[PDB]
Swiss-Prot record:
Belongs to the DNA repair metallo-beta-lactamase (DRMBL) family. It comes from Homo sapiens. This is DNA cross-link repair 1A protein. May be required for DNA interstrand cross-link repair. Also required for checkpoint mediated cell cycle arrest in early prophase in response to mitotic spindle poisons. Possesses beta-lactamase activity, catalyzing the hydrolysis of penicillin G and nitrocefin. Exhibits no activity towards other beta-lactam antibiotic classes including cephalosporins (cefotaxime) and carbapenems (imipenem). It is found in: Nucleus. Expressed in brain, heart, kidney, liver, pancreas, placenta and skeletal muscle. Binds constitutively to TP53BP1. Binds CDC27, which is itself a component of the anaphase promoting complex (APC). Binds PIAS1.
């Protein structure tokens, strides 16, 4: 059964609630983004209205084969009416097509559901500037001060400089980038741009990328692996055994691999600055873990919430343990006492 933090009170709406069968009283199912923990349960047999971004709707139709009659794509930054209730979708700064949802309830209550997000000061000049928010449904993934990591811009500078140096020293090197979901496309696109190459990948991953409305994408990606020196592979294959195996398949075109594993936060972020990061190496194979996050750091999250000044916060991540719930509630109260709301 559907938990309480996935239901929007005063409405017939749920958010990211497809794995519970038919939810009693739900007339519209919202999907914030195309990540499997959130879409879990959707398929071609789903027969209620799904509300989402255009990009999420392209993925639902082409990857999960949801029928078109049940997909309701909404434009961003635009007031829409769904089952008699005013809604707005806002860019979440997460993966492609990810949104936050503003609900203006009939009784005057205003609710913001962040979905998954990476808070940014640019959100302080969205359509949120105007107004009061009574309830915030918050992505609390990294809600503790130990969670630090660099800007996306610093991490991409490190990746492009590392890949450009390696291939300039060795023109016969191959670069590989792991993936297991949408998001983090800047990593492989920026590296291919500095090397003057298209990105090579499987037909399945190409299909996914073709649903994302990325400008000039046809100029940037390919299924012809042999024509490319930046390859995408499943994240599970980014290890010395899977990379050795891949190099065999390339028919003596390359004599070295440089590989990247974009992660979220890891333990080494407690100690090692991005500029100082080194790879794991075995023979002619090197593997870099790089902390490219699509969720808020602790500081980014705290800034956003102290700006917004919501009356009540409902966490949507780390809700399963009493220790996590207590820790999050203590930080919410600190933030409220410090800022005076
Ligand atoms: Ni996500």
């Amino acid at each position: 059964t559907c938990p309480f933090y996935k239901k929007i009170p005063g409405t017939g709406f749920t958010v990211d609630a497809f794995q519970y069968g038919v939810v009693e009283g739900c007339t519209a199912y919202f999907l914030t983004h195309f990540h499997s923990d959130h879409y879990a349960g959707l398929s071609k047999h789903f027969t209620f209205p799904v509300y989402c971004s255009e990009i999420t709707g392209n993925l639902l139709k082409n990857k999960l084969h949801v029928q078109e009659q049940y997909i309701h794509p909404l434009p961003l930054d635009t007031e829409c009416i769904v089952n008699g209730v005013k809604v707005v979708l806002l860019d979440a700064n997460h993966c492609p097509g990810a949104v936050m949802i503003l609900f203006y309830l009939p009784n005057g209550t205003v609710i913001l559901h962040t979905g998954d997000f990476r808070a940014d000061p640019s959100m302080e000049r969205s359509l949120l500037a105007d107004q009061k928010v009574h309830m915030l449904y918050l992505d609390t993934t990294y809600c503790s001060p130990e969670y630090t990591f660099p800007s996306q811009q610093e991490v991409i500078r490190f990746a492009i400089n590392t890949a450009f140096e390696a291939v300039t020293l060795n023109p016969h090197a191959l670069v590989v980038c792991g993936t297991y979901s949408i998001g983090k496309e800047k990593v492989f696109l920026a590296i291919a741009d500095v090397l003057g190459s298209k990105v090579g990948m499987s037909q399945e991953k190409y299909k996914t990328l073709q649903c994302l409305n990325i400008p000039e994408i046809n100029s940037l990606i390919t299924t012809d692996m042999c024509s490319s020196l930046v390859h995408l592979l499943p994240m599970m294959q980014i290890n010395f055994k899977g990379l050795q195996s891949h190099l065999k398949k390339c028919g003596g075109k390359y004599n070295q691999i440089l590989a990247f594993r974009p992660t979220g936060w890891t333990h080494s972020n407690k100690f090692t600055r991005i500029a100082d990061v080194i790879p794991q190496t075995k023979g002619n194979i090197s593997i870099y873990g790089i902390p490219y996050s699509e969720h808020s750091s602790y500081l980014e999250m705290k800034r956003f919430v102290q700006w917004l000044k919501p009356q009540k916060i409902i966490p949507t991540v780390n809700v399963g343990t009493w220790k996590s719930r207590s820790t999050m509630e203590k930080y919410f109260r600190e933030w409220k006492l410090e800022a005076g709301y």
